[PDB]
Design a protein around this motif. Structure first.
Motif, mmCIF file in Angstrom:
data_model
loop_
_atom_site.group_PDB
_atom_site.id
_atom_site.type_symbol
_atom_site.label_atom_id
_atom_site.label_comp_id
_atom_site.label_asym_id
_atom_site.label_seq_id
_atom_site.Cartn_x
_atom_site.Cartn_y
_atom_site.Cartn_z
ATOM 1 N N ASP A 117 30.574 21.869 27.235
ATOM 2 C CA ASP A 117 30.243 20.605 27.875
ATOM 3 C C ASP A 117 29.170 19.830 27.123
ATOM 4 O OD1 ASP A 117 29.314 18.769 30.371
ATOM 5 O OD2 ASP A 117 31.241 19.721 30.828
ATOM 6 N N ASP A 118 28.630 20.382 26.038
ATOM 7 C CA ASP A 118 27.609 19.668 25.282
ATOM 8 C C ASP A 118 28.055 19.346 23.860
ATOM 9 O OD1 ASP A 118 27.601 22.366 24.645
ATOM 10 O OD2 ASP A 118 25.598 22.730 25.427
ATOM 11 N N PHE A 119 28.439 20.357 23.085
ATOM 12 C CA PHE A 119 28.762 20.155 21.681
ATOM 13 C C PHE A 119 29.353 21.438 21.122
ATOM 14 C CE2 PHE A 119 24.212 20.939 22.186
ATOM 15 C CZ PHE A 119 24.112 22.175 21.604
ATOM 16 N N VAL A 120 30.090 21.296 20.022
ATOM 17 C CA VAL A 120 30.606 22.420 19.254
ATOM 18 C C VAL A 120 30.314 22.156 17.784
ATOM 19 C CG1 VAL A 120 32.370 23.321 20.798
ATOM 20 C CG2 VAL A 120 32.874 21.339 19.408
ATOM 21 N N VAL A 121 30.241 23.235 17.006
ATOM 22 C CA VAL A 121 30.027 23.158 15.567
ATOM 23 C C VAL A 121 30.934 24.173 14.889
ATOM 24 C CG1 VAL A 121 27.611 22.451 15.805
ATOM 25 C CG2 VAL A 121 28.174 24.846 15.428
ATOM 26 N N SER A 122 31.079 24.016 13.578
ATOM 27 C CA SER A 122 31.868 24.918 12.753
ATOM 28 C C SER A 122 31.593 24.602 11.295
ATOM 29 C CB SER A 122 33.362 24.785 13.049
ATOM 30 O OG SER A 122 34.033 25.994 12.766
ATOM 31 N N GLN A 158 22.154 25.572 11.371
ATOM 32 C CA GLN A 158 21.345 24.370 11.227
ATOM 33 C C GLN A 158 21.736 23.323 12.260
ATOM 34 O OE1 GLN A 158 22.129 26.584 8.527
ATOM 35 N NE2 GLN A 158 21.945 25.260 6.742
ATOM 36 N N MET A 159 23.038 23.104 12.456
ATOM 37 C CA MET A 159 23.380 22.098 13.458
ATOM 38 C C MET A 159 23.208 22.605 14.887
ATOM 39 S SD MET A 159 27.146 21.423 11.886
ATOM 40 C CE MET A 159 28.074 22.660 10.999
ATOM 41 N N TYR A 160 23.270 23.917 15.125
ATOM 42 C CA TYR A 160 22.854 24.462 16.418
ATOM 43 C C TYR A 160 21.413 24.085 16.723
ATOM 44 C CZ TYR A 160 26.791 27.528 17.605
ATOM 45 O OH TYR A 160 28.013 28.037 17.960
ATOM 46 N N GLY A 161 20.512 24.391 15.782
ATOM 47 C CA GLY A 161 19.116 24.038 15.950
ATOM 48 C C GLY A 161 18.895 22.557 16.162
ATOM 49 N N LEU A 200 18.198 17.820 20.240
ATOM 50 C CA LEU A 200 18.352 16.369 20.295
ATOM 51 C C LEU A 200 19.278 15.920 21.423
ATOM 52 C CD1 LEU A 200 16.618 16.074 17.816
ATOM 53 C CD2 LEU A 200 18.433 14.772 16.727
ATOM 54 N N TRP A 201 20.175 16.788 21.876
ATOM 55 C CA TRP A 201 21.142 16.412 22.914
ATOM 56 C C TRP A 201 20.571 16.060 24.289
ATOM 57 C CZ3 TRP A 201 23.749 17.990 27.444
ATOM 58 C CH2 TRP A 201 24.975 17.359 27.663
ATOM 59 N N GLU A 202 21.148 15.034 24.904
ATOM 60 C CA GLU A 202 20.781 14.592 26.241
ATOM 61 C C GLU A 202 22.070 14.358 27.018
ATOM 62 O OE1 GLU A 202 18.294 11.331 26.925
ATOM 63 O OE2 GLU A 202 16.470 12.238 26.109
ATOM 64 N N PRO A 203 21.996 14.388 28.352
ATOM 65 C CA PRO A 203 23.215 14.147 29.129
ATOM 66 C C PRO A 203 23.417 12.666 29.455
ATOM 67 C CG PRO A 203 21.482 14.942 30.564
ATOM 68 C CD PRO A 203 20.869 14.815 29.196
ATOM 69 N N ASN A 204 24.675 12.268 29.648
ATOM 70 C CA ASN A 204 25.050 10.897 29.995
ATOM 71 C C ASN A 204 24.471 9.889 29.002
ATOM 72 O OD1 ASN A 204 25.284 11.167 33.649
ATOM 73 N ND2 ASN A 204 26.751 11.572 31.998
ATOM 74 N N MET A 205 24.942 9.984 27.762
ATOM 75 C CA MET A 205 24.502 9.101 26.692
ATOM 76 C C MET A 205 25.493 7.962 26.491
ATOM 77 S SD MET A 205 22.731 11.302 23.660
ATOM 78 C CE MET A 205 24.141 12.321 23.268
ATOM 79 N N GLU A 235 26.115 4.126 21.611
ATOM 80 C CA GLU A 235 25.088 3.886 20.602
ATOM 81 C C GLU A 235 24.223 5.120 20.390
ATOM 82 O OE1 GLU A 235 22.776 0.442 21.198
ATOM 83 O OE2 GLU A 235 24.481 -0.939 21.198
ATOM 84 N N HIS A 236 23.620 5.627 21.466
ATOM 85 C CA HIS A 236 22.750 6.788 21.345
ATOM 86 C C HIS A 236 23.522 8.022 20.910
ATOM 87 C CE1 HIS A 236 19.353 4.819 23.680
ATOM 88 N NE2 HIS A 236 20.365 3.981 23.816
ATOM 89 N N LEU A 237 24.787 8.129 21.310
ATOM 90 C CA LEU A 237 25.615 9.235 20.850
ATOM 91 C C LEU A 237 25.798 9.190 19.337
ATOM 92 C CD1 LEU A 237 27.427 11.629 21.761
ATOM 93 C CD2 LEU A 237 29.265 9.988 21.953
ATOM 94 N N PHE A 238 26.094 8.005 18.797
ATOM 95 C CA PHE A 238 26.238 7.855 17.354
ATOM 96 C C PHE A 238 24.941 8.201 16.640
ATOM 97 C CE2 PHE A 238 25.474 4.991 13.740
ATOM 98 C CZ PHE A 238 26.382 5.526 12.856
ATOM 99 N N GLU A 239 23.823 7.666 17.133
ATOM 100 C CA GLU A 239 22.530 7.968 16.527
ATOM 101 C C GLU A 239 22.266 9.466 16.498
ATOM 102 O OE1 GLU A 239 21.359 5.513 15.102
ATOM 103 O OE2 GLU A 239 22.303 3.872 16.204
ATOM 104 N N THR A 240 22.516 10.155 17.611
ATOM 105 C CA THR A 240 22.218 11.580 17.675
ATOM 106 C C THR A 240 23.124 12.396 16.761
ATOM 107 O OG1 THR A 240 21.491 11.293 19.964
ATOM 108 C CG2 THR A 240 21.898 13.535 19.198
ATOM 109 N N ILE A 241 24.434 12.140 16.777
ATOM 110 C CA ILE A 241 25.324 12.956 15.954
ATOM 111 C C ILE A 241 25.054 12.716 14.472
ATOM 112 C CG2 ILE A 241 27.228 11.297 15.992
ATOM 113 C CD1 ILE A 241 29.010 13.973 16.243
ATOM 114 N N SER A 242 24.737 11.476 14.095
ATOM 115 C CA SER A 242 24.443 11.194 12.696
ATOM 116 C C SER A 242 23.134 11.846 12.265
ATOM 117 C CB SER A 242 24.400 9.685 12.477
ATOM 118 O OG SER A 242 23.069 9.219 12.506
ATOM 119 N N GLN A 243 22.073 11.660 13.059
ATOM 120 C CA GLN A 243 20.783 12.264 12.746
ATOM 121 C C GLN A 243 20.857 13.780 12.708
ATOM 122 O OE1 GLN A 243 18.334 10.599 15.839
ATOM 123 N NE2 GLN A 243 17.677 8.876 14.555
ATOM 124 N N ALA A 244 21.802 14.372 13.434
ATOM 125 C CA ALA A 244 21.951 15.819 13.381
ATOM 126 C C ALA A 244 22.680 16.261 12.126
ATOM 127 C CB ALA A 244 22.684 16.318 14.623
#
Lengths: 240, 233, 239, 234, 229, 204, 247, 202
Positions: free
Chosen positions: F133-138, F144-147, F152-157, F160-169
């Motif tokens: 319900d939050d994110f997956v990585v592979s 590194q992306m787990y950390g 950085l993740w927040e609920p109900n984004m 815009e903020h979703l793009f900023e967070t995924i890119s910054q991660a």
């Protein structure tokens, strides 16, 4: 009545009426042996009776039996062609053993009946083999329902009954049993042997001796399939 | 009605009896065995002057010492020819020596009768062949000439004729032949009988002729030598 | 058009192909069997067609196992096929379970094999019937008889062949339940000589066999001295 | 008129017309004769006159050191059977390092011949045989039939017009045992002379002779190797 | 081991008379009826036993396939059983692959493909039975019908077996598109009643329904109340 | 290891009625870069994408077989597939080769075709589906992306903020991996829009 | 057994194949289908055979069967065989795409299917499929196309064909109203409506006895769109008007 | 595992422990290692649990079919031969040491060993399992010909107690089974009823 066109009376293909004549002939093959069976189920018991007419007195009659044992608590009686019936009994025994091996418990009577019936339906469809010319009747005690009585036929139809009768005198032997399911639950107590013997004798006029029948039994008190002795049969016959 | 394998009230195998009748509608061939070699000769039976005559090959070479001449269904004969070639090459490969005319005729005769339509093979024949054969060659005993039928019976001859005029060709071969011939008189008489029985005029492009002798290999006659021989006759 | 296949019931529920394979037997020379307290005794009237053959050709008594005999009637090639099948069945049983096969089980196995050839259009039913017989300290003597259709019953005395009618009629007047093999053998010789026709068939051969307690449960052929005496007795009885 | 085509159809009389016809095929061939004495067995055949120019045939073939046969009928089927018998004897010698008994060989032959007679779309072998062999128990003269049953006999003849040879054989069988090899062979050639019509007598190239015995392998006698046997038949 | 040639072939006029004869067989079964309503479907049959000896409870004509599909038949019962078994297997395979319940249209397509295979293979005859399928998925009720040849349709109200002509002739009149499931049951029963030649009873007929909650066949205690009106 | 032979890093994140998936572009062999425009994200549906990481040959093969089966399904049924159904089909495909498996770990992100409810999921090499319900990585920089995501993740984004967070991660995750980089592409699956972007990363 | 064999794959005393000759006559009595090619796309227009009131129109069509992102077909004859053929065509197209990573061309699709139709007439003992097909499509090399197969297994490209019932008179009137190269999609629709109006024995069309699909290229994409009842009704009204005005 | 069986006139006596380990951990401590093959035939299991369970099931099914079609009670020899056939056919993949004991109306009580390898033998008494090696001298010095039922029960219980007190892979409770012409008898010897033998002190 029903016209024919082509190879209708030689293989299992539809007639201009959709009748499958080659299956109406196995029913006539059933009446070739010249015997008659009658099965009656009671409130706590199921009973089989079978004519035992040996041709003349050189046979070892301890081998001429129409009663068979499938598992400990299931018994059967055949009518029709002897070798066909032997093959069908072998098939039923194998099915009953495989069920237990696969699922861990003992097969029910209706499940075994349905297996035999769908095995025969295949002979009704492919053209290289012929249908088996024999009928079958089964009895047993179901731990949930109680006594059960089922019957197959060469066409693949496997209804369940309160009291059956198969053989040469089928129509009148069932017309007799028709009148007696009116009341008293057809004498629903361990003495339905009386009813079976009476129904077999009424339209045959034999008043059988102590050794021209075979009877089999399952009970709720003892579930295993037992074959009653001559003395036991004689006592019932004597009472009559 | 019947199957392919079905005896008759005389035990005759109808299909083989028909495949045998399929031979009285072919072009005549002739073989003759001498003390100096064998000779084969077959009519070509041209149809119309627009057909190339160098395209009718009825006398093939099985090996450097065996040749064959056929009649009947030239389309059917080709599988037999191929299998005979393959068997001879296998025998060379395994034993480092040349096969024998007897062995080749015997191995080829074992394909006949190998037909049927149930539990036969993945791909099997459905009818008998319709070709009669004539083998010639030299081996460790000398020149030999055999004959094969669709039934699978092979014999050894010294002067045999197969085809649609054989009942007339043998009636002359039995008078002409003797145990003291030479291959040259053999060739002459084999040409005289052909001319006797054919429908056209025996000239140097509607016949065929080959010879094997103890010295040489299988050799085919040329439109030079053949013409000279015909003219000489 | 119902006479040509074993996959076609007649309009009355019959199978004429099996009915014809039965005629094939119903006109072959006779063979009998007799059960006794101690054991069983087989007897067959073997026909000698011409002088040329050696006596011993076309035997009808086989050895299916070391305690089972077998007598045949009908097409001898089909009979030999069935004998190989039975030998196969007994050997497999011993290799699976470690002891000798019961006659009841063997007959059941061979009858199923015979019946499998009565259902299809790709095969034809066998044209021979046969009898078995054994002796075991457990169940004593036994005797069975299988038909071209595959039915197998137990008997006290059987008469497969062409003179079955006259054979059975004379064997029923015997009281076999008390006799013994030495006392039965003579009776088999006598009844076969009685049922034998001496007009159509001129010369016939007689061979006997038995399996009982005197042979310790092994099937054998009757020795030559017993046989000669039996023949003499039969001749004397016949008049 | 509908039971005479397939080998898996009984007639209303319980007969197999196909097997019958396959037997009438065997009667077409030229006659053969076999017989045995105390220590030797003998086959004699009559090679048929095919034409005025062809070498006659091969009617006697080696099967093994102690077994030889002589055929009458379809030659393709005959050599198909001969190959099976040869493989049987070879297989025997490979596994047990000893020869094969003629009786067990004939058992295998009959069991193999019977299978075709029962299945759909197949036909019987159209060839009759005559086997001769030597073993621990002496000579043997078995005979086989298209219907797979076989026989055992002192002396038997198969082929066209062999009824006369059979009559001669039985009429003179009283002395075959004691007789010597030369005497034994002549008895065979006389019997074979019986079936020939009036216009022909045995010559030196239309007869073959096979011999197997105690201290002697199976041998065939060629065109002029049969001369020491035909010198006395007056 | 089996025949390899077809038993159904074309005729000089292009007909397939083996399929026509399987249809003539179907025309002699027992009446069946299906009616699609605004919130469910209804299947109703004539389960008339030959005599009083026969135990009615043992055999049923209205069967389920999954938790949301059920079907009835007309024609031949031993063939109907084979079809029921293969349909159950087909549904289980679909659920195994997709972890989703199969839709009614996919079910009918696969069953009709099997029935078609039995018109062109070697050494077999066609089935002598037509089917009536029921279902509910994605908030909608469905009702199809399959023929012995392999051709399936989609209906609002149909009728099989004997007297199907008059059955659908009567069915066309009353049918409304706004019909509730409980008032559709009356019409289904009434349609059966037109050609029964007897007296209706809780054991003469079988009735199954399908709505939002799944498939189930009514019990005789409920068929009694429905027959009371 | 075999799944570290071509590198790669995939990531998906969930918002309020929106999903986002991202990957890197580098394609290389053990220690040498070949190209920088490798495609690792595939459009399985109108609003249904899949991202593959691992061995590049198996990435390509599995993508092609999946497109095969999905075309056949949408032609036979008559509608588009759902995110949950697609996940089961991929798990079945991967489990068919339980012995001798593909070396690829997929990631799914889509929108429900009728409720517009997001969906993210990842599968392991053998076909084990885990829905979050939050994110997956592979990939190779999973830790590194787990950390990064946990912090950085927040609920109900918003998108815009979703793009900023995924890119910054993704940036800071791949800046510490040797065999990943050369740029990042980000897909934003909204209800009526699908916006694609390319970030400026480091090229060493 | 030989007694029951029917010998579906043998020659006749005159070189004919009777089972194929009979399947063609089966296809003779089916519903009318017709296709027409134009400058900017192709079109199909079938006839609805099952008109019962109690039916259901759940499917987007009855005889269309989109086979690919660029093609589509229509059938006449036996529906049960048609279903098998359509499944096979879809599988062939996907196998091509898997091997080459490009869409398949229309002639290659038609060829791969006609091979299967032909293998049923030479060996096996079975009977042949009683189905005729029409195809429409678009590819890189030749653009808009229109083909036709038959039970025997031979095809051919056309510009305006027709199968089914009264297809003879349909083609006869098609020959006199088709002009190569100048036809647009609208004139195509007009001719199709006016041919269907006659070659059907009924008094006049009904906009529910018909079924119409088209195919175009728009923005580098193929669009296959089944026309709607209102559109069809408008077309019928237009046909009614102009025809009435002339006389 | 320590299984055992001894023979007396009329039937046999069986016995076993109850511990199933995995290395040095006790996964199950109430295991039942005696299984019924037929109404009057049993078998003791040792080795691999999955192997022995699968083989017991297959043999049970085969023997039930054989006896139902032959129409009589089966034989201990037949059961032992079916076991031997399977164990020899799969001799390289399975790990099972079995002891078969039962009663038949023709010979009474018999005891058969089928060690891993697939060889068969008849014996008067047999021990098997991991702990059986510690009591060979004891069964050699204690057995005497012609014992009775109670003496056999006592003998088996004492031997099994001595095995369990020394083998690290054995323990729990003792399960006994005396089989006769009447029927089957099952008892458990748990806790304080295990026959204690004197331990040396000081």
């Amino acid at each position: 009545r029903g016209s024919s066109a082509g190879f209708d009376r030689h293989i299992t293909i539809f007639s201009p009426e959709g009748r499958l004549y080659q299956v109406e002939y196995a029913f006539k093959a059933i009446n070739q042996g010249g015997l008659t069976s009658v099965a009656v189920r009671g409130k706590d018991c199921a009973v089989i009776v079978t004519q035992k007419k040996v041709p003349d007195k050189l046979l070892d009659s301890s081998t001429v039996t129409h009663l068979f044992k499938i598992t400990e608590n299931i018994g059967c009686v055949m009518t029709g062609m002897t070798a066909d019936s032997r093959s069908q009994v072998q098939r039923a025994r194998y099915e009953a053993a495989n069920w237990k091996y696969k699922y861990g418990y003992e097969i029910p009577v209706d499940m075994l009946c349905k297996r035999i019936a769908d095995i025969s339906q295949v002979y009704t469809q492919n053209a290289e083999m012929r249908p088996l010319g024999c009928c079958m009747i089964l009895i047993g005690i179901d731990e949930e329902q109680g006594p059960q009585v089922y019957k197959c036929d060469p066409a693949g139809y496997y209804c369940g009954f309160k009291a059956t009768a198969a053989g040469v005198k089928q129509t009148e032997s069932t017309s007799f049993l028709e009148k007696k399911v009116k009341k008293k639950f057809d004498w629903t107590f361990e003495q339905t042997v009386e009813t079976a013997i009476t129904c077999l004798s009424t339209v045959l006029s034999i008043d059988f001796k102590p050794s021209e029948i075979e009877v089999g039994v399952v009970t709720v008190e003892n579930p295993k399939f037992r074959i009653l002795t001559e003395a036991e049969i004689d006592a019932h016959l004597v009472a009559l | 009605d019947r199957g392919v394998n079905t005896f008759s009230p005389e035990g005759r195998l109808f299909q083989v009896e028909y495949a045998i009748e399929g031979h009285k509608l072919g072009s005549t061939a002739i073989g003759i065995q001498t003390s100096e070699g064998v000779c084969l000769a077959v009519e070509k039976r041209i149809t119309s002057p627009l057909m190339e005559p160098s395209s009718i090959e009825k006398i093939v070479e099985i090996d450097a010492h065996i040749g064959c001449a056929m009649s009947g269904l030239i389309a059917d004969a080709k599988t037999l020819i191929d299998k005979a070639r393959v068997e001879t090459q296998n025998h060379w490969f395994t034993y480092n020596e040349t096969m024998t005319v007897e062995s080749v005729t015997q191995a080829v005769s074992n394909l006949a009768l190998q037909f049927g339509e149930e539990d036969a093979d993945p791909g099997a024949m459905s009818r008998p062949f319709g070709v009669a054969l004539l083998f010639g060659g030299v081996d460790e005993k000398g020149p030999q000439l055999f004959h094969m039928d669709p039934s699978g019976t092979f014999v050894q001859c010294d002067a045999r004729a197969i085809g649609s005029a054989s009942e007339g060709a043998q009636s002359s071969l039995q008078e002409v032949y003797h145990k003291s011939t030479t291959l040259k008189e053999a060739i002459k008489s084999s040409l005289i009988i052909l001319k006797q029985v054919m429908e056209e005029k025996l000239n140097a492009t509607n016949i065929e002729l080959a010879t094997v002798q103890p010295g040489q290999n299988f050799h085919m006659f040329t439109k030079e030598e053949l013409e000279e021989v015909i003219k000489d006759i | 058009g119902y006479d040509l296949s074993a996959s076609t019931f007649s309009p009355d529920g019959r199978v004429f192909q099996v009915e014809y394979a039965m005629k094939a037997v119903e006109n072959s020379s006779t063979a009998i069997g007799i059960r006794c307290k101690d054991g069983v005794v087989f007897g067959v009237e073997k026909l000698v067609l011409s002088k040329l053959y050696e006596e011993g050709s076309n035997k009808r008594l086989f050895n299916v196992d070391r305690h089972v005999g077998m007598a045949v009637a009908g097409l001898l090639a089909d009979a030999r096929s069935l004998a190989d099948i039975a030998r196969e069945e007994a050997s497999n049983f011993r290799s699976n379970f470690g002891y000798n096969i019961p006659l009841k089980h063997l007959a059941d196995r061979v009858a199923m094999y015979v019946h499998a050839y009565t259902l299809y259009s790709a095969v034809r039913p066998f044209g021979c019937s046969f009898m078995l017989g054994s002796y075991s300290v457990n169940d004593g003597a036994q005797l069975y008889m299988i038909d071209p259709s595959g039915v197998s019953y137990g008997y006290w005395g059987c008469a497969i062949g062409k003179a079955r009618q006259a054979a059975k009629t004379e064997i029923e007047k015997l009281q076999m339940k008390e006799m013994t093999c030495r006392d039965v053998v003579k009776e088999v010789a006598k009844i076969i000589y009685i049922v034998h026709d001496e007009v159509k068939d001129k010369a016939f051969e007689l061979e006997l066999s038995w399996v009982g307690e005197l042979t310790k449960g092994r099937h054998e052929i009757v020795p030559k001295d017993v046989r000669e005496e039996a023949e003499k007795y039969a001749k004397e009885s016949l008049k | 008129n509908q039971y005479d085509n397939d080998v898996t159809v009984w007639s209303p009389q319980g007969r197999i017309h196909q097997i019958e016809y396959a037997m009438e095929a065997v009667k077409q061939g030229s006659a053969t004769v076999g017989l045995k004495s105390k220590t030797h067995a003998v086959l004699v055949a009559l090679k048929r006159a095919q034409s005025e120019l062809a070498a006659h045939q091969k009617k006697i073939l080696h099967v093994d050191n102690h077994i030889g046969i002589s055929i009458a009928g379809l030659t393709a089927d005959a050599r198909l059977l001969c190959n099976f018998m040869r493989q049987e004897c070879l297989d025997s010698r490979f596994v047990f390092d000893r020869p094969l008994p003629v009786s067990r060989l004939v058992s295998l032959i009959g069991s193999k011949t019977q299978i075709p007679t029962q299945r759909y779309g197949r036909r019987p072998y159209g060839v009759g045989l005559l086997i001769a062999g030597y073993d621990d128990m002496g000579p043997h003269v078995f005979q086989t039939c298209p219907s797979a049953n076989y026989f055992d006999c002192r002396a038997m003849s198969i082929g066209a017009r062999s009824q006369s040879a059979r009559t001669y054989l039985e009429r003179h069988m009283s002395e075959f045992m004691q007789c010597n090899l030369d005497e034994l062979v002549k008895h065979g050639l006389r019997a074979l002379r019986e079936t020939l019509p009036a216009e022909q007598d045995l010559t030196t190239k239309n007869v073959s002779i096979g011999i197997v015995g105690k201290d002697l392998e199976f041998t065939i006698y060629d065109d002029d190797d049969v001369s020491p046997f035909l010198d006395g038949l007056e | 081991r089996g025949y390899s040639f077809s038993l159904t072939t074309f005729s000089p006029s292009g007909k397939l008379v083996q399929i026509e004869y399987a249809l003539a067989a179907v025309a002699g079964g027992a009446p069946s009826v299906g009616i699609k309503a605004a919130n469910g479907v209804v299947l109703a049959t004539e389960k008339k036993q030959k005599s009083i000896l026969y135990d009615e409870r043992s055999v049923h004509k209205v069967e389920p396939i999954t938790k949301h599909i059920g079907l009835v038949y007309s024609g031949m019962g031993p063939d109907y059983r084979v079809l029921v078994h293969r349909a159950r297997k087909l549904a289980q395979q679909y659920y195994l692959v997709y972890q989703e319940p199969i839709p009614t249209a996919q079910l009918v397509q696969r069953v009709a493909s099997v029935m078609q295979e039995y018109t062109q293979s070697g050494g077999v005859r066609p089935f002598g039975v037509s089917l009536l399928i029921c279902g509910w998925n994605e908030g909608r009720p469905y009702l199809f019908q399959s023929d012995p040849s392999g051709a399936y349709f989609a209906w609002k109200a149909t009728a099989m077996g004997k007297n199907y002509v008059n059955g659908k002739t009567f069915l066309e009149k009353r049918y409304n598109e706004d019909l509730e499931l409980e008032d559709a049951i009356h019409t289904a029963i009434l349609t059966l009643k037109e050609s029964f030649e007897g007296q209706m009873t809780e054991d003469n007929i079988e009735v199954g329904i399908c709505n939002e909650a799944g498939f189930r066949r009514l019990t005789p205690t409920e068929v009694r109340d429905y027959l009371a009106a | 290891s075999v799944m570290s032979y071509n590198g790669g890093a995939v990531m998906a994140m969930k918002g309020k009625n929106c999903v986002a998936i991202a990957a890197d572009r580098r394609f290389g062999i053990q220690a040498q870069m070949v190209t920088t425009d490798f495609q690792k994200i595939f459009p399985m549906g109108d609003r249904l994408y899949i991202g593959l990481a691992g061995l590049a040959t198996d990435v390509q093969t599995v993508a092609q077989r999946l497109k095969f089966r999905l075309n056949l399904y949408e032609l036979k049924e008559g509608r588009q597939i759902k995110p949950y159904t697609l996940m089961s089909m991929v798990a079945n495909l991967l489990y068919e080769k339980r012995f001798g498996p593909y070396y690829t770990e997929p990631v799914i992100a889509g929108l429900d075709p009728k409720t517009f409810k997001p969906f993210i999921c990842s599968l392991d090499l053998i076909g084990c589906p885990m829905v979050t319900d939050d994110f997956v990585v592979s990939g190779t920089c999973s830790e590194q992306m787990y950390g990064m995501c946990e912090s950085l993740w927040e609920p109900n984004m918003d998108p815009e903020h979703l793009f900023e967070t995924i890119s910054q991660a993704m940036l800071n995750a791949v800046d510490r991996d040797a065999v990943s980089g050369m740029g990042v592409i980000v897909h934003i699956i909204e209800k009526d829009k699908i916006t694609t972007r390319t970030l400026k990363a480091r090229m060493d | 057994s030989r007694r029951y064999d029917s010998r579906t794959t043998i020659f006749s005393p005159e070189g004919r194949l009777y089972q194929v000759e009979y399947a063609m006559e089966a296809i003779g009595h089916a519903g009318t289908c017709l296709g027409i090619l134009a400058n900017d796309g192709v079109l199909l227009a079938a006839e609805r055979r099952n008109i019962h009131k109690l039916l259901d129109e759940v499917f987007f069509s009855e005889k269309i069967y989109k086979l690919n992102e660029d093609m589509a077909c229509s059938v006449a004859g036996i529906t049960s065989d048609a279903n098998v053929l359509t499944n096979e065509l879809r599988l062939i197209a996907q196998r091509y795409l898997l091997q080459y990573q490009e869409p398949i061309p229309c002639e290659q699709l038609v060829t791969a299917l006609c091979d299967i139709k032909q293998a049923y007439t030479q060996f096996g003992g079975k009977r042949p499929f009683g189905v005729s097909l029409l195809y429409i499509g678009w590819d890189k090399h030749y653009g808009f196309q229109l083909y036709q197969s038959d039970p025997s297994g031979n095809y051919g490209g056309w510009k305006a064909t027709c199968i089914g019932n009264n297809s003879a008179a349909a083609v006869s009137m098609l020959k006199q109203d088709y002009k190569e190269g100048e036809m647009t999609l609208k004139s195509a629709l007009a001719l199709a409506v006016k041919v269907l109006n006659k070659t059907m024995d009924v008094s006049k069309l009904s906009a529910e006895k018909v079924e119409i699909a088209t195919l175009t290229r728009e923005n580098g994409k193929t669009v296959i769109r089944v026309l709607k009842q209102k559109e069809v009704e408008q077309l019928i009204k237009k046909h009614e008007e102009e025809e009435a005005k002339a006389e | 595992t320590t299984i055992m069986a001894v023979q007396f006139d009329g039937g046999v006596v069986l016995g076993a422990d109850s511990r199933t380990t995995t290395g040095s951990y006790i996964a199950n401590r109430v295991t039942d290692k005696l299984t019924p093959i037929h109404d009057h035939i049993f078998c003791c299991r040792s080795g691999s649990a999955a192997d022995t369970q699968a083989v017991a099931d297959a043999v049970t099914y085969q023997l039930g079919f054989h006896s139902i079609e032959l129409n009589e009670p089966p034989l201990v020899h037949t059961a032992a031969s079916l076991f031997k056939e399977m164990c020899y056919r799969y001799r390289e993949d399975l790990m099972a040491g079995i002891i078969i004991a039962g009663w038949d109306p023709q010979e009474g009580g018999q005891v058969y060993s089928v060690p891993m390898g697939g060889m068969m033998v008849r014996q008067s008494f047999a021990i098997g399992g991991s702990g059986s090696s510690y009591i060979y001298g004891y069964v050699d010095a204690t057995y005497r010909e012609g014992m009775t039922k109670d003496e056999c029960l006592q003998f088996t219980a004492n031997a099994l107690a001595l095995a369990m007190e020394r083998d690290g892979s054995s323990g729990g409770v003792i399960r006994l089974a005396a089989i006769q012409q009447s029927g089957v008898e099952r008892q458990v010897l748990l806790g304080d009823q295990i026959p204690k033998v004197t331990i040396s002190t000081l």
